[PDB]
Symmetry: D2
């Protein structure tokens, strides 16, 4: 029969956290990056990857001025970032809360190959995820991140890949909700290949339908969840060009056909597009004439920090310049989230 996965108090707490994350005008700063994931970004400048460099970069992202507060509703942190401190001794989660944001943590442990598939991968990280999520909850993290990676090929994504990614996302969501942490479901579809907008929309619809069927199967409280889907965009190698309005229409149509309205908000990821392109696409999505029952906010790792990283240059002199670049990008992304961004 009906065995309640969450009590009404747990559901209320999850809904409150989720609505706080994607409150109107607020988005997510995806500051989560592994040691090797941020290694390439720090090597783009020439500055070495150390604990102090990582801490200072994340402090620069997190210790922005008051203008970021109504634009960042959540920050996804890496495991080490959740336990680093600001220059004044303030812990990074407490820095995030003091600015009105919601502390998040990347709980997935990377992607692993799926045998018998054309390079398809599934995401691991469910081992001890209950204890890890409980500890993150005691450490200030109120929501979690789980990146499931799918791509588009001549035979990809297959039934096995979509099914397994949806199942692992549903299990991660169940664990996070049991631990009082809002799960952000991220069935990312890589914009790699020559696939057009139509194929990306079809694949996104299939992936999201399977993801939400798995969430229903795992008794996931959708009001206590957020979605982190790829923007429906043509592949990087696609020759045909689509306008921002076309991309927005395709993305909103894909979301409306799969995502139930109970989902508190949809926090898009950049997916390899430039900062200006991501902001304009988010603005067009929020300006789509189709009725959108969810908060179509942003959860950007590169689209919010690329300019700040370039301006910073790895040296302390450009702290203010990089902070200003990140702040103006967050302002632009919040405007796009409200649909009022005009570059």
């Amino acid at each position: 029969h009906s065995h309640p996965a969450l009590t009404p108090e747990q559901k209320k707490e999850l809904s409150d956290i989720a609505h706080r994350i994607v409150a109107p005008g607020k988005g997510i700063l995806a500051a989560d990056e592994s040691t090797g994931s941020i290694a390439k970004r720090l090597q783009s400048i020439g500055t070495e990857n150390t604990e102090e460099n990582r801490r200072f970069y994340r402090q620069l992202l997190l210790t922005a001025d008051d203008r970021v507060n109504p634009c960042i509703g959540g920050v996804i942190l890496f495991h080490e970032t959740l336990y680093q401190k600001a220059d004044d001794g303030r812990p990074f989660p407490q820095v995030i809360k003091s600015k009105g944001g919601v502390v998040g943590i990347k709980v997935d442990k990377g992607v692993v190959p799926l045998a018998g598939t054309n390079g398809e991968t599934t995401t691991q990280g469910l081992d001890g995820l209950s204890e890890r999520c409980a500890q993150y909850k005691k450490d200030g993290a109120d929501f979690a991140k789980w990146r499931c990676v799918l791509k588009i090929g001549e035979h990809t994504p297959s039934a096995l890949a979509i099914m397994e990614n949806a199942n692992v996302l549903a299990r991660y969501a169940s664990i996070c909700q049991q631990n009082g942490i809002v799960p952000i479901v991220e069935p990312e579809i890589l914009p790699d290949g020559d696939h057009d907008l139509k194929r990306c929309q079809y694949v996104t619809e299939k992936v999201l339908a399977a993801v939400y069927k798995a969430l229903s199967d795992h008794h996931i409280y959708l009001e206590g969840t957020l979605l982190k889907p790829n923007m429906v965009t043509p592949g990087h190698a696609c020759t045909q060009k689509y306008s921002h309005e076309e991309i927005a229409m395709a993305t909103v149509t894909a979301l409306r056909r799969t995502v139930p309205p109970a989902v508190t908000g949809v926090t898009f990821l950049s997916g390899g597009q430039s900062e200006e392109e991501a902001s304009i696409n988010l603005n067009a999505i929020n300006k789509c004439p189709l009725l959108k029952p969810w908060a179509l906010t942003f959860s950007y790792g590169r689209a919010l920090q690329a300019s700040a990283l370039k301006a910073w240059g790895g040296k302390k002199e450009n702290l203010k310049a990089a902070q200003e670049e990140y702040v103006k990008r967050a302002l632009a992304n919040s405007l796009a989230c409200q649909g009022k961004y005009t570059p």
Copy 2:
């Protein structure tokens, strides 16, 4: 890859029909009673079940005065009703179109038992459904009806029953959309038993999630479909009492957790409740503070025709009385559809 089930013109036609059916203030008159299904209703008076009697009753339901036009956006007819005419020789589908309504047809061929299940049934009617739907399209039927019956027991509905009903609903929807006919997906859950509101909501969420996963699997154009779910209500034998606001909250919550917003509208069925109760529940559903992205209209067979049948009495003298009663009930149901029904 992506093989288009429907061309953009077919999708546009289906969306236009679906939006016409559930345009604001309009609902569905379910006159899709078989010869044996209407036999019990005609025996409640004492009037014999006759082709002429059935024709006159359906003409009475259909030939109401002009004030019922903006309240009925669709009428589902039986196979024989689609080919009967009014007293003036006007065909019943043409009578429906002349009043601004959309002609519908019940295309399912009844329910059949599922072996190995606790009295669970699946719906048949897929044989030659393409040719039947094409003929109905040439005969004026712009949408179809398929009643899938589920109930709640100690071990019911099972995985097999929900999966099979969802699969057959998706196949029926695919056939109807290929034939240019808007499919009304009706995964009705019987309000039989002592199950409470919570169990009904859980079962409705599971059934609707499976139904829409099957619709996604069958490449169903959800904008060209309508949903006919049971109102989330306690069982008929349930001792615990629930307010209309509680029933509305449960129903809207179940719909928001499973139904994608792309669905043009949700047309509730009575499900064995009285006319006043059904209208009040629909009004409370449309007054629910939760955001509702779809047209929450009515598709009532008994809640729209029970008092009209009682007033008619099987004799021609109460023709006008039954017209008046059915028209006032349709006005009340339209007000509930707009959320402005105050009895």
Copy 3:
């Protein structure tokens, strides 16, 4: 919980029928051809398609001498063939029983296209299948045939096609078993295209695994069922050549990886290969060193009748010649079924 789909008496009857059909040395004569299906075969000779012509041809197939009795364990008939009579007035089902065979009927109503798929089809025929199967049981038919057609393409068979074909096969099996009729599950995979033996084996394994998962989901009594799979063979357009031993190894390996041993027997279909090729492939399959827990018999439509049609010529003078040719082919196929066929 566990609701028994079949009583122990029904299970015993189904097991008895299934074991009678595929008793060692016995196979199935697939004599079921629709009016248009046999129209092409009769036009290949030059003789018109006539009720009398069809009756005489099926009598020629069924009124063979005593040497066919231990070689044919079942005969699948068309609906009209089940009610035709021999020249002496003996009904065709009674003719089949008098020879020790088991009367079968084709209960599927053809294949219909699946929308959104690359030319993929699903099989219809579930409407009133319970009443039809009951009537066939009263008319002497003890088993039924349901041809589900799948093919291999660059994106085919898809998840939807395999899932829907398996589901419809499971529903047909449930109905047949409820009506006391042994269902022959036929998830035929067309040997059309340039796909190699490896791809055919992979597709056969996936299709059969889905088919038997659906049979388990529908509570199908596998001991009262038979399987009619395509022999794992390269496509007709495949350039690479495979020996009969390679084809047999691939087929037996695909069956052992998917088919549970509870299945009473596996009755292969020719699938567009010549009579001698089909017999040699069946012999090699039965000579495969891998352990085979089921009766690997034959259910051949063309591989038992092509030479019979060629000899017959549509005229009564070659009745004996066509009977002798069919009898020798049936003896060869029985020898292959026992693994002792040496051409």
Copy 4:
């Protein structure tokens, strides 16, 4: 299309390992027990749980005399047991190989609760399972163990529990096969409750069908796998008594309806039954008149070590007594595996 999960060399190695494990007359000694899992067994005597006590007990189980060599085809070890040595300095995996056995390892990391279920659990351990399995392969482990726990209740096992356990078993099997390690699929069904033999058989059939469908979906090489199912037995609280022949018939029937013959062998677990009862049930299973295409061997944790533990008593004086007790029990279990056990 068909992307080979395993090369023919990998498939050959997995088949060789699997056939070595369940070679006729040989079974598995399930010596895998966590520190807390063996803590209760060591506390049953009164001897403290230390590293040295565990090492001596596992050495006793592994360094038995030569008469246990043809009875044990595999030994499942815990993580710490794989890295302990004998008294002479021989590593435990090398001790196992020197006796003709195949070294196994418990790779699952325990069970975790499933939210929304009636106490149902899923098994974790997929994080870094590729690296762990590769290291175990370099450390002598040629097969792995993954215990998935299902129980029987009024609403249990549910669709979510069976589906999730099958998915995680298939993922574990895929990882193990990619790492050259034979996966032993253990969808254990707890004999807890008052459920009878019929319901246990029904649940076992459903669980095994879902497990093998998941294995097919994950492209698992079934010839390189072994099955560790529960014997189909009535619950511990079941009042109705079933004979050993009835239990054997139910178990063999459940296996034949769901397990494909490609599975190299079936290694039953004790499931909380006594040593003599487990051996007698295995003997009856191997004496079942139904045709059994797989090696129905034993993989017993308590049914091979309970008497040895009682005899040992935690003191070195009963080393030889426990040796003889365990060896006689293993000989009895091997005789049951061959069907020649007469107590």
